[PDB]
Design a protein around this ligand. Structure first.
Ligand SMILES: CCCCCCCC/C=C\CCCCCCCC(=O)OC[C@H](COP(=O)(O)OCCN)OC(=O)CCCCCCC/C=C\CCCCCCCC
Ligand SMILES: CCCCCCCC/C=C\CCCCCCCC(=O)OC[C@H](COP(=O)(O)OCCN)OC(=O)CCCCCCC/C=C\CCCCCCCC
Ligand code: HEC
Ligand code: HEM
Ligand code: HEM
Ligand code: HEM
Ligand SMILES: CO/N=C(/C(=O)OC)c1ccccc1CO/N=C(/C)c1cccc(C(F)(F)F)c1
Ligand SMILES: CCCCCCCCO[C@@H]1O[C@H](CO)[C@@H](O)[C@H](O)[C@H]1O
Ligand SMILES: CCCCCCCCO[C@@H]1O[C@H](CO)[C@@H](O)[C@H](O)[C@H]1O
Ligand SMILES: CCCCCCCCO[C@@H]1O[C@H](CO)[C@@H](O)[C@H](O)[C@H]1O
Lengths: 101, 49, 79, 59, 67, 241, 379, 55, 54
């Protein structure tokens, strides 16, 4: 329901990665699944993620953040990887299930 | 194309003597290096002590 | 060998100046401090709280311990 | 301009830079110790044996 | 004869609102404790509050009058 | 039996982080120990030579040590024997062993004072409050025979009879030997006995601070200098797009 | 190979771990503790040896040998101070090192983490046996109190203990074997530290944002060698200030008294860095249960890698975890405080609360909140 | 300086114990370096000719 | 062991006389030093004879 649909927007702003100009998916810990997903991203999406991340690291070393104008807005955050990652995991679960059978 | 690329302005960081784009930066180079190296040499003396 | 096998990277340009052309600690008042304050602000309400709670629990327990050492006149009113 | 002279004479050639550190340390020690001791004793006037010594110093 | 600045300052200090009050509670305790024959009570606590207040006062001034 | 009185903080002349001991006070404190406390209290870790250059002259120290007979030996026939003391000897022990010590103090054992001010919470403030804090027990409190009431001693019943009183001795430097003056001196002496390095330690502290201030600043600049390259660095994303 | 820094079988090693070693560009001051821990270790070993050269492992001479060192050895008093206080600098650093790791998910580098846990355990054992050497009152009683805990282990109880003491109580045979152990362990620490760094180099350092830093790495030198040297002097100042101006601030005056087995000190409590564990120990009234609790209070660290539920590595972007984190830190100061207090009301009840919350936060809350946060990110 | 006094005496003995306890560990350390250099080439053999043809 | 001129000799004797198998350990340690050198001298010899020093 549209209840926690607000909570999310709240958490999203509490987290604060948007202050670094990062997308939610940019902050994912790169375990195995995530690593595979990243290999599937189209070139353009991949390079954009790369610049965003490098940009964030540079801000982090400088101990600064992006001007308020440049912060990613909750509703404009692109879940660019979630689709691929969801697929990668099903495939894995398929194989896992099949190899027990 | 690369012709469209230019170096951002570093006035917010440049040292006073190389702030002016129409002045040779060499004339103040021994000054800028002499200072920083002086700090360093002093640390060595403080450490050697 | 670890430099050159790290990441596929494209289209990023970076500009940097020698350390002798720039200032070691630039814009202390226009940039530094504001940010120091900014950083402190953003964290104080996450860090401080529990430390404050700790202090209280500390004060209580210390005072409560001393109070129990004192005598209650209500044990000698009879005699 | 001392900074330039310094740079040219002392900090440019790595050999002279080391010479400056050594000769610099020798002079720094002599000076720094005298000052420290001086400060310490002044902050403790008449408390050190150096101060009261004369009272019993007399063969 | 000689006089120990300690004893002198002890007096000046006992003439303090703080001491006078602590000293007062003590004498009360002393009184009732001395006037019974089957009580546990002691006046340590009261004596301590007095000595604490008095001696804290003495510290502030004593070393001034010593060599 | 519960409840304890904590001593107050006296302003010792050697309390400041940069303030040495008042050696004149230490010298008198030695006299107190030598003429009063040394009767029952041993100070095993200090030797007469330790006084030299601190509170006494070499000639003075040599004389002080000679006032004592020490047991040396064995000799040719494997016999122990007496001899006059040297500055290399340590302050004489009042008793052969603890058993003999208790035997002469009502089963109470006067502890060695070499480290007393560090072996007790409160340090000199404690020892000072104790020496000058003897008084009558409050109502309801009875001190068993042999013990003396002291509010500053845990349990409040100490086995040491008040050791000092006005004029119990004479300072040969002409200082008025009041009770508190004596306690103050012997306590200053005890501090020194516990840590002879006291002054040197603080003189070093001073040097540590100055150099630490200088060096830290210098290194801060250098770190900043090198990192300026990354701190001011600017980047851009320029896809063929 | 062109430069001899890469070809040489040794310099190559020095170069691949201290010069051309790829390091994230954004690691903060919290990453400065690894190097401090190393330097700290080199220093303890150095001052340790210097002390060992004047010490005598014998109940009849230990105490006075330490005293002879402080009173007669040229700068012996200084060396003694630096060694004793250095042990604390060591723990302060080790606790911040660990903290940094929990907060930033450094524990996901499992092997680097486990060796790390082992370093901590070894460091504690080292400080425990070290403390006994001066043979003062707290030296002896602390040794007694802790070693007696093992007689509580059913069956191999009285055995393991009498085997450890080399007799029926803490006595000379214990002192001499403890000296050998104290002299030895630091060298195991140095050894294991190498393994620690070896596993670490497999992945390289993690960073505060928790995302891949391959896009922006800089050579360890001069960036971090300078940053680390600076961090060294910054910490070293308070250390020396304490050791030179307030030498006995952290120590127990009870240790200025020769050990005496016929006189139990009123308050047998450890150096500050063990207090938290001492509190947990006493939280469980029951010799055996308390011992297990004590053990678990540190062994718990081996579980951290398996209690990570977040989809993100660090806690930088996890505010709920952040407070839980600081709650925990405060939890620790509380335990430290309870540890220094007598076993009485209200300290007793407070103690069990603190002990209980300690394990709950690490075992139940952290993993739970992490899962909860995953949902709030629509994951 | 080595004796820590004017003759071989207690101060010498205690520092010698420390050294004796210590050096063996340096030997273990250096032994690792020994084998590390060694592995660069591998063992030599009694005929003194390359053994790559038969390892 | 006890590193003190007044106890060293006897601490070694106490080890050999009281410690369980202390006498054996002492023997193995003292004699092991010789096994060590015999081995080190043959190791070196081998090296000289076979040019391992290269
Ligand atoms: C009386 C005392 C006199 C005798 C003392 C002898 C000691 C003299 C030492 C030799 C002189 C050093 C020569 C250095 C030359 C190399 C060099 O490049 O400089 C060092 C170089 C700097 O690079 P640049 O700024 O780019 O210089 C370029 C020059 N054109 O590297 C450095 O940063 C080193 C200086 C900083 C030292 C940091 C040390 C911090 C330590 C502090 C703790 C205290 C010490 C305790 C020691 C423990 C011992 C058990
Ligand atoms: C363990 C033994 C217990 C002993 C007592 C524990 C030590 C007590 C001293 C208190 C610690 C002082 C630290 C105060 C510093 C406050 C501060 O800076 O916090 C905010 C800051 C914000 O960081 P970001 O989210 O990355 O921000 C990036 C964008 N700007 O947080 C940090 O710096 C990270 C925290 C790491 C340091 C942790 C230090 C505490 C140490 C305790 C060890 C606990 C862990 C488990 C041990 C069990 C055994
Ligand atoms: C007659 C022997 C005697 C003299 C003289 C004496 N003492 Fe004591 N002292 C004792 C005894 C006995 C004790 C043990 C008290 C106890 O434990 O009940 C003691 C204990 C002490 C203690 C404290 C013990 C504790 O547990 O806190 C201090 C400190 C002390 N003496 C200081 C001094 C000083 C300083 C002097 C000289 C000014 C002095 N004493 C002179 C007999 C003496
Ligand atoms: C004597 C003790 C130790 C030494 C000398 C040591 C040394 C180091 C060094 C030099 C580093 C690299 C720099 C840094 O990140 O700080 C490091 C990293 C690390 N150490 Fe330790 N360490 C010690 C104890 C431990 C302990 C007790 C833990 C954990 C229980 C631990 C966990 C780690 C981990 C996980 C990292 C990864 C840092 C990152 O996230 O990049 N270490 N350690
Ligand atoms: C991991 C590093 C070390 C730690 C954590 C450590 C810790 C300690 C501790 C806590 C003490 C008690 C200090 C006191 O209060 O008096 C101590 C004493 C001592 N340590 Fe270490 N130590 C370390 C390494 C060493 C080494 C390598 C040696 C020498 C081979 C050594 C030799 C001694 C000696 C002789 C003492 C007794 C003298 C004294 O107590 O000051 N230590 N150590
Ligand atoms: C604690 C002492 C030493 C240890 C533990 C040690 C150990 C070893 C080991 C394990 C090997 C490989 C097996 C072998 O060929 O024997 C080796 C080889 C060798 N060691 Fe040592 N060694 C020691 C001392 C020395 C000494 C004193 C020398 C020469 C002065 C030396 C020279 C060599 C050389 C040149 C080789 C090459 C052997 C070949 O020709 O293949 N080692 N050593
Ligand atoms: C030999 O005792 N050393 C003590 C000390 O302070 O050394 C710095 C001490 C002092 C008082 C009480 C308990 C201890 C013992 O330490 N206490 C605890 C409670 C402890 C806790 C966890 C682990 C370990 C160990 F074994 F080192 F591994 C010990
Ligand atoms: C105050 O005496 C000091 O004692 C030191 C002993 O370590 C000496 O090194 C100092 O030179 C001396 O001034
Ligand atoms: C952070 C670096 C701190 C280094 C501080 C060095 C100061 C040590 O200085 C010492 O002072 C003593 C007292 O005057 C002298 O007796 C010693 O000879 C001298 O080396
Ligand atoms: O980790 C590092 O790994 C390197 C490669 O194994 C070693 O050479 C270094 O000594 C070690 O510290």
């Amino acid at each position: 329901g549209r209840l926690m649909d607000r909570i999310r927007k709240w958490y999203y702003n509490a987290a604060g990665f948007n202050k670094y100009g990062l997308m939610r998916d940019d902050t994912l810990y790169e375990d195995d699944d995530v690593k595979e997903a990243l290999k599937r991203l189209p070139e353009d999406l991949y390079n954009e993620r790369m610049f965003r991340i490098k940009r964030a690291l540079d801000l982090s070393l400088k101990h600064r953040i992006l001007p308020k104008e440049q912060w990613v807005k909750y509703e404009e955050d692109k879940p660019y990887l979630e689709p691929y990652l969801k697929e990668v995991i099903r495939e894995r679960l398929e194989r896992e299930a099949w190899n027990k059978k | 194309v690369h012709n469209d690329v230019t170096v951002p302005d570093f006035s917010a960081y440049r040292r006073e003597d190389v702030m002016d784009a129409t002045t040779s930066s060499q004339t103040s180079s021994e000054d800028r290096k002499g200072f920083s190296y002086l700090v360093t040499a002093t640390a060595c003396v403080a450490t050697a002590y | 060998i670890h430099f050159g096998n790290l990441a596929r990277v494209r289209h990023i340009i970076t500009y940097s100046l020698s350390p002798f052309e720039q200032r070691a600690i630039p814009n202390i008042f226009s940039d530094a401090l504001p940010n120091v304050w900014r950083r402190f602000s953003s964290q104080v309400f996450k860090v401080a709280p529990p430390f404050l709670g700790a202090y209280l629990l500390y004060s209580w327990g210390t005072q409560e311990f001393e109070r129990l050492k004192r005598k209650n006149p209500a044990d000698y009113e009879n005699d | 301009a001392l900074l330039r002279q310094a740079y040219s004479a002392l900090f440019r050639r790595t050999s002279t830079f080391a010479l400056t550190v050594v000769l610099g340390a020798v002079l720094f020690e002599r000076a720094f110790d005298q000052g420290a001791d001086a400060i310490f004793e002044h902050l403790n006037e008449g408390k050190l044996w150096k101060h009261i010594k004369h009272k019993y110093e007399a063969s | 004869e000689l006089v120990d600045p300690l004893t002198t300052i002890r007096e000046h200090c006992e003439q303090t609102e703080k001491c006078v009050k602590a000293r007062e509670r003590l004498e009360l305790c002393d009184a009732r404790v001395s006037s019974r024959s089957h009580t546990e009570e002691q006046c340590t606590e009261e004596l301590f509050d007095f000595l604490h207040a008095r001696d804290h006062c003495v510290a502030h001034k004593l070393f001034n009058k010593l060599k | 039996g519960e409840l304890e009185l904590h001593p107050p903080a006296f302003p010792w002349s050697h309390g400041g982080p940069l303030s040495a001991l008042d050696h004149s006070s230490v010298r008198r404190g030695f006299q107190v120990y030598k003429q009063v406390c040394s009767a029952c209290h041993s100070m095993d870790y200090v030797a007469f030579r330790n006084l030299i250059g601190v509170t006494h002259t070499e000639a003075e120290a040599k004389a002080l040590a000679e006032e004592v007979e020490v047991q040396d030996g064995p000799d040719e026939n494997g016999e122990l024997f007496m001899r006059p003391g040297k500055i290399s000897d340590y302050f004489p022990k009042p008793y052969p062993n603890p058993e003999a010590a208790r035997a002469a103090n009502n089963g109470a054992l006067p502890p060695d004072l070499s480290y007393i001010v560090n072996a007790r919470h409160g340090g000199e403030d404690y020892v000072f409050s104790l020496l000058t804090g003897y008084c009558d027990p409050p109502a309801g409190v009875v001190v068993r025979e042999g013990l003396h009431y002291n509010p500053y001693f845990p349990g409040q019943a100490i086995g040491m009879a008040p050791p000092i009183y006005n004029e119990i001795l004479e300072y040969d430097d002409g200082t008025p030997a009041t009770m508190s003056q004596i306690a103050k001196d012997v306590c200053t002496f005890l501090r020194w006995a516990a840590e002879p390095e006291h002054d040197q330690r603080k003189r070093m502290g001073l040097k540590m601070l100055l150099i630490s201030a200088l060096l830290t600043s210098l290194l801060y600049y250098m770190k900043r200098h090198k990192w300026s390259v990354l701190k001011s660095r600017k980047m851009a994303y320029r896809p063929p797009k | 190979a062109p430069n001899i820094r890469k070809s040489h079988p040794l310099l190559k090693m020095i170069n691949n771990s201290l010069i051309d070693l790829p390091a994230p560009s954004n690691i903060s001051a919290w990453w400065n503790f690894g190097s401090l821990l190393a330097v700290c270790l080199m220093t303890q070993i150095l001052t340790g040896l210097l002390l060992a050269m004047h010490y005598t492992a014998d109940t009849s001479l230990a105490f006075s040998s330490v005293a002879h060192t402080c009173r007669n050895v040229q700068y012996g008093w200084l060396i003694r101070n630096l060694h004793a206080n250095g042990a604390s600098f060591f723990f302060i650093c080790i606790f911040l090192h660990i903290g940094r790791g929990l907060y930033y998910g450094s524990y996901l580098y499992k092997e680097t983490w486990n060796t790390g846990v082992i370093l901590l355990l070894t460091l504690m054992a080292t400080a425990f046996v070290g403390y006994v050497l001066p043979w003062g009152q707290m030296s002896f009683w602390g040794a007694t109190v802790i070693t007696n805990l093992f007689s509580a282990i059913p069956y191999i109880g009285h055995t393991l203990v009498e085997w450890a003491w080399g007799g029926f109580s803490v006595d000379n045979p214990t002192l001499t074997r403890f000296f050998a152990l104290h002299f030895l362990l630091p060298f195991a620490i140095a050894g294991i530290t190498i393994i620690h760094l070896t596993f670490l180099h497999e992945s390289g350092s993690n960073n505060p944002l928790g995302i891949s830093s391959d896009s922006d790495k800089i050579p360890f030198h001069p960036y971090y060698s300078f940053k680390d040297i600076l961090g060294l002097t910054l910490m070293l100042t308070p250390f020396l200030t304490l050791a030179l101006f307030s030498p006995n601030l952290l120590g127990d005056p009870e240790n200025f008294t020769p050990a005496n087995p016929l006189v139990t000190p009123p308050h047998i409590k450890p150096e500050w860095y063990f207090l938290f564990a001492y509190a947990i120990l006493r939280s469980i009234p029951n010799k055996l249960g308390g011992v297990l609790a004590l053990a678990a209070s540190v062994l718990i660290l081996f579980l951290i890698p398996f209690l990570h539920k977040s989809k993100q590595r660090t806690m930088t972007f996890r505010p709920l975890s952040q407070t839980l984190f600081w709650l925990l830190v405060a939890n620790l100061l509380i335990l430290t405080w309870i540890g220094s207090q007598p076993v009485e009301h209200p300290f007793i009840i407070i103690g069990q609360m603190a002990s209980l919350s300690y394990f709950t936060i690490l075992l139940i809350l952290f993993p739970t909140i992490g899962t909860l946060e995953n949902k709030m990110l629509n994951y």
